[PDB]
């Protein structure tokens, strides 16, 4: 035990050069892939707006071409999934988690074209889904493809290169280098068994893909919020209360997403016809709502800066939240290709702002700004539903750049994770994998 | 597969008892760190008061500089050799051992020894950090509450020991994230998996950071302002800086170890020659902390000055060499106090130096040496202790220049790569390995 430890200590932080060089090429590819994907979604959302201008006169005809375009593109995505790669439904992060435990296959020859071109359909149609789902799974498969193509041998190389791709995938989705790396070593990292995931190698992958992202998406931030006010020590207890509120809601949102997966499965019964058709009905509803109330539909990044500044009324915040809860469930729970990670930022922001508004008028002596509660709440749902607070915190921090709010951000987040545990909730990425694995043995 | 479904659904479930105890650990570690911080300042203040009362006679003032620092150093060195030998040097390697169940945590001894012992070495003006003391002290605080409350299990033993070590680093820098990251990057038994609960570590760090801000608000340890950005066509220069840190990283690791040896011959383990030599070094610090304050002291003072580009080229090379020398004489001679902080000051200075050369070599890039200072700051931490992700987030938390995250990562990564390929080893692991190998020798 002691003799062996001296051997281990002196051998620590030694990753074979072959793995390192390969980690670089993984990130490089994942970056370009994510960039190309990002351009596609924009290009398609652009075309949809072009068609609405060509029919800007006839109101019912305008509402028709909103629905149809979104339906046609959704159906295209839903089809590409059920026909070629079933594993590429929903997020795909739980699928990568399985692959790390050697419990799921990585069929890159299938998923890469299916998740890519399939995502372009669902995201480009205006559905309430994130890019992370697609980019993380895509990124992992890119890491497997280069393992296969270059025929690399070992448990280290199989897990490490699969991980760096998943990280560079999240990194390139948010321009968040650290959030990518932390997400792996907090959520993924086989959470019960020690692994051979080399941290140094994950880093390189993330760097390359972040650079790739900046080559094409420089001079513009995804979220601009400006520098907000500070938070006095005598206001911290208000952030802990915000955590508790997220702490009870966290698991409840997790029940709904799962339950809704079930309720939507009855509608089609596994039938590729009823599924693709229902998928288009939901997709069409989003392109419709992304016109009559754009805040209810779409990714959600657009309404974050607006919400933080306090430009919405109280009534409008409650409306947005309820409608966005509904639309988030209908898109993700119906197995569409696309993550739930980003929509959860938008929900936390909105809920946080709402709490801030109440807080502002209840305590003028504190000199509050609802915006700080928006930024505290942003990564709070991520802490109470995915149970990766340290990832959520650093993600928000990397995207909003308000370090002076690190304490409220931590406290709210920790508050969320505590009450999420004590009300019997479970990490949503783990529960979706466990349901897939339990249903895999439920027909044997 | 069946076992995995059982694991997945049981993940992130930490017994409430451990959580509530995590809170109390951090609370204690915070106050302790604060009290420790006040003491060091209090004593540095006294030393300056005595220099005023003899500000006339030049050799007389140089004497009371030496003596005060010698007397306080001796007090620290003695308190270590007499009561707790394990509390020499940093103490982070000692806590790493304790996590692998390979070293004992004698809190009844170390708490008073490291505390009052550190107050002597740090308060005397020696080139050592607060982390060493605070992390070790923090861990023992986590052991003390395990013992006093009689908590049972491998989880409770490792978790509460960890949160204290993290809350210890957090309260040393006002760096909550750097504390947590450092545990789950450096410490976390690097070869077998453990029961260290991440959620529990958080709570401890929160409470101790709150404790730090209750007494040390409205002032940051380092202010540097918002620096300029870094264009994509300039990133290759940060990679080169990493390479230079990558070759030097392991070589600085050689000297620290070699110097532990060279200084052991001087006293041979003798509590008289040790304490006396300890005072000679300690006295040299209080002397240099007057005739050239940059060469002595913790180092946080000269960081803001260096980043702004207020030093000349000659002055930067001088400070570096002198600061290399004084960093080794203080840490390698087993004095209670970390090497973590002095390494920030070295990296800053080296970074700035590279920046100055870069500025004049490339006017087309519109450079500012200050960005290379902040890139270099956590670079030596990446090349000598080989915890880059911790180093990066530490600097980030202390400088608040997120726009430099790419250069900071690139430089850091560059350092860790070339530190590996020139046969260097994580210094906190090597110091544990040497203590464990000499234990069976």
């Amino acid at each position: 035990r002691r003799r062996q430890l001296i051997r281990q200590l002196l051998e620590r932080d030694k990753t074979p050069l072959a793995i390192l060089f390969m980690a670089a090429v993984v990130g490089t590819l994942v970056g370009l892939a994510a960039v190309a994907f990002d351009k596609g979604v924009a290009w398609l959302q652009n075309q949809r707006m072009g068609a609405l201008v060509h029919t800007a006169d006839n109101y019912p005809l305008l509402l028709t071409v909103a629905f149809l375009c979104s339906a046609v593109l959704a159906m295209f995505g839903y089809f590409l999934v059920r026909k070629y790669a079933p594993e590429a439904g929903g997020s795909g992060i739980p699928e990568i988690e399985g692959a790390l435990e050697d419990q799921r296959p990585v069929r890159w020859w299938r998923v890469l074209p299916v998740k890519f071109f399939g995502g372009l359909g669902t995201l480009g149609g205006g559905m309430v889904l994130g890019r992370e789902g697609p980019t993380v799974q895509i990124g992992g498969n890119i890491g497997r493809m280069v393992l296969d193509i270059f025929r690399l041998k070992g448990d280290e190389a199989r897990h490490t290169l699969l991980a760096t791709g998943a990280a560079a995938g999240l990194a390139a989705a948010f321009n968040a280098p650290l959030a990518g790396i932390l997400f792996i070593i907090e959520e993924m990292r086989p959470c019960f068994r020690y692994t051979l995931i080399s941290i140094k190698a994950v880093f390189i992958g993330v760097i390359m893909s972040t650079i790739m992202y900046r080559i094409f998406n420089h001079e513009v931030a995804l979220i601009d919020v400006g520098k907000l006010s500070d938070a006095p020590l005598n206001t911290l207890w208000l952030y802990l209360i915000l955590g508790i509120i997220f702490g009870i809601f966290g698991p409840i949102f997790n029940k709904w997403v799962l339950g809704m997966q079930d309720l939507l499965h009855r509608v089609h019964g596994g039938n590729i016809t009823k599924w693709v058709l229902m998928g288009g009905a939901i997709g069409g509803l989003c392109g419709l709502l992304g016109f009559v109330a754009p805040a209810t539909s779409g990714g959600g990044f657009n309404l974050i800066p607006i919400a933080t500044a306090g430009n919405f009324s109280m009534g409008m915040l409650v409306f947005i939240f309820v409608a966005r809860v509904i639309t988030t469930l209908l898109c993700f729970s119906s197995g569409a290709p696309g993550g739930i990670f980003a929509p959860m930022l938008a929900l936390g922001t909105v809920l946080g702002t709402a709490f801030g508004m109440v807080a502002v008028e209840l305590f003028p002596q504190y000199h509050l700004e609802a915006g700080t509660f928006a930024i505290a709440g942003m990564g709070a749902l991520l802490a109470a539903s995915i149970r990766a607070p340290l990832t959520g915190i650093i993600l928000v921090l990397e995207m909003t750049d308000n370090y002076q709010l690190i304490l409220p951000m931590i406290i709210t987040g920790l508050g969320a994770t505590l009450l999420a545990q004590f009300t019997g909730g479970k990490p949503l990425y783990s529960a979706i994998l466990a349901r897939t694995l339990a249903k895999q043995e439920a027909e044997q | 597969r069946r076992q995995l479904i059982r694991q997945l659904l049981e993940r992130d479930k930490t017994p409430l008892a451990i959580l509530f105890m995590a809170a109390v650990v951090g609370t204690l570690v915070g106050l302790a760190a604060v009290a420790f911080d006040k003491g060091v300042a209090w004593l540095q203040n006294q030393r300056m008061g005595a220099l005023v009362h003899t500000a006339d006679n030049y050799p007389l003032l140089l004497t009371v500089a030496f003596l005060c620092s010698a007397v306080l150093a001796m007090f620290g060195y003695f308190l270590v050799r007499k009561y707790a030998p394990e509390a020499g040097g940093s103490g982070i390697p000692e806590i790493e051992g304790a996590l692998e169940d390979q070293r004992p945590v004698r809190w009844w001894r170390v708490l008073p020894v490291k505390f009052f012992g550190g107050l002597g070495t740090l308060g005397g003006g020696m080139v050592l950090g607060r982390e060493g003391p605070t992390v070790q002290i923090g861990g023992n605080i986590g052991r003390m509450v395990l013992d006093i409350f009689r908590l049972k299990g491998d989880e409770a033993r490792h978790t509460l020991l960890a949160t204290g070590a993290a809350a210890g680093l957090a309260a040393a820098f006002n760096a909550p994230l750097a504390g947590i990251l450092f545990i789950i990057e450096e410490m976390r038994p690097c070869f077998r998996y453990t029961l260290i609960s991440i959620k529990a570590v958080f709570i401890g760090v929160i409470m101790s950071t709150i404790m730090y801000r209750i007494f040390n608000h409205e002032v940051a340890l380092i202010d540097v302002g918002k620096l300029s950005d870094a264009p994509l066509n300039t990133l290759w220069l940060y990679l080169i800086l990493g390479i230079i840190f990558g070759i030097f990283g392991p070589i600085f690791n050689k000297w620290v170890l070699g110097m532990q040896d060279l200084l052991h011959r001087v006293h041979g383990g003798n509590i008289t020659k040790w304490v006396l030599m300890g005072g000679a070094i300690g006295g040299l610090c209080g002397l240099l902390g007057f005739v050239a304050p940059a060469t002595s002291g913790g180092g946080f003072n000269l960081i803001p000055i260096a980043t702004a580009g207020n030093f000349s080229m000659g002055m930067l090379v001088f400070i570096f060499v002198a600061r290399v020398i004084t960093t080794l004489l203080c840490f390698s001679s087993g004095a209670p106090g970390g090497i973590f902080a002095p390494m920030l000051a070295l990296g800053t200075v080296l970074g700035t130096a590279f920046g100055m050369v870069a500025v004049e070599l490339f006017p087309q890039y519109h450079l500012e040496a200050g960005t290379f200072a902040i890139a270099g700051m956590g670079a030596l931490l990446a090349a000598s202790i080989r915890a880059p992700l911790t180093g990066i987030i530490l600097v980030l938390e202390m400088t608040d220049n997120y726009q430099l995250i790419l250069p900071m990562i690139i430089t850091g990564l560059g350092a860790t790569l070339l530190a590996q390929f020139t046969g260097g080893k994580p210094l906190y692991s090597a110091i544990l390995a040497r203590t464990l190998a000499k234990q069976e020798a």
Partner: antibody
Amino acid sequence: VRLLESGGGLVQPGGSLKLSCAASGFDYSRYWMSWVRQAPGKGLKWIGEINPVSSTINYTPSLKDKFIISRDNAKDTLYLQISKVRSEDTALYYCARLYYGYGYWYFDVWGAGTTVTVSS
Amino acid sequence: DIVLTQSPAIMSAAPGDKVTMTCSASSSVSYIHWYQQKSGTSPKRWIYDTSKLTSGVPVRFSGSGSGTSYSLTINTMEAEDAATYYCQQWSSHPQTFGGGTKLEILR
């Protein structure tokens, strides 16, 4: 965002004048600022540049204190003093804000210009 | 200091024509910028880093080239394009401007 430069007009040969450029609409203490000139009917010629913290000031190959560039972040103004003026300095002086894409710096936003006539 | 030379000093074209003017350098330049200066107006940053368009610049414009030759191209030129176009580099120091290419319209 607007750059409004002023202080031009008539100056004697051998004399000196101080040009100002008042800036507004952007965080002025964040950008490098520059001066470019254009003689009547001719092309553009870079004069100088100055970083926000006034520590770096590069000029075109000129004499001693031919040009002197300074900035006052409190007033949001860029200054240019020209010494020992000869007819080659009879031009239109643009005050420009500097920036980059990949890193190869360009003249982002230009002012309207002030004219200087060196005549008797 | 690198000397930029712009091929046609003055050129005439009728709207609808494809138009190309050239910026040639004495040494080796990378990522050059173009400025438009219409009559009695200040130069406006038009094309940057060789081929990127500034916001508001119509898609009819395009830049390219590398090494010692760079070009600005108007695909189907339009009458509103009557201006003098200056190229500029800052890959070396000091940065330097071209001579100008005055575009005139045939109507």
